[PDB]
């Protein structure tokens, strides 16, 4: 919590054209006409086994 207050006070200082270059996230077509600028986290799970539906992408590998 003490380091997080140091990170944010650096961010109000640097100008507007620097905040576009160091911006987090990527635009993702969630549904028909819906783009939300999400953030990706990976996960490995060995306990709950199930068949997979409700995925956005059929091909699993990183595309570019």
């Amino acid at each position: 919590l003490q380091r997080a207050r140091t990170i944010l006070e650096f961010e109000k200082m640097l100008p507007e054209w620097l905040r576009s270059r160091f911006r987090m996230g990527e635009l993702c077509k969630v549904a028909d006409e819906d783009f939300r600028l999400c953030l990706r986290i990976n996960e490995v799970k060995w306990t709950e086994w199930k068949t997979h539906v409700s995925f956005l992408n059929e091909d699993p590998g990183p595309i570019r």
Binding site: W49, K50, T51, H52, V53, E58, D59, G61
Partner: protein, 114 residues
């Protein structure tokens, strides 16, 4: 306009739409000059960019009626006698090279289609 409809009816679960398109594949190859009919019918089911066939597309998209869709596709490949090349197809891209339809059916935990 034929190949894009077969991949769409398979992914969504349309049974009667899929069966109507398969009779048109027999009727389109019947008027063909007829040199490489087993070679011609394969590239009407295989995506030339990735190598994915229509049997792979059914198993990636599990439907409440996906057990009857697989039975329709196997009876089509049995009549025209390309059943060996249809059930043993592989990807050609480097990211998925070697993946067949049986790797897909085991990963979706399907004990019956296997």
């Amino acid at each position: 306009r034929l190949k894009k409809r077969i991949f769409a009816a398979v992914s969504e679960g349309c049974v009667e739409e899929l069966r109507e398109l398969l009779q048109d594949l027999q009727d389109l190859c019947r008027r063909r000059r007829g040199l490489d009919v087993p070679d011609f019918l394969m590239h009407k089911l295989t995506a030339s960019d990735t190598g994915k066939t229509c049997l792979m597309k059914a198993l990636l998209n599990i439907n409440p009626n996906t057990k009857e869709i697989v039975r329709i596709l196997l009876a089509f490949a049995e009549e025209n006698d390309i059943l060996d090349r249809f059930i043993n197809a592989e990807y050609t891209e480097e990211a998925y090279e070697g993946q067949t339809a049986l790797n897909i059916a085991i990963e979706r935990r399907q004990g019956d289609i296997t």
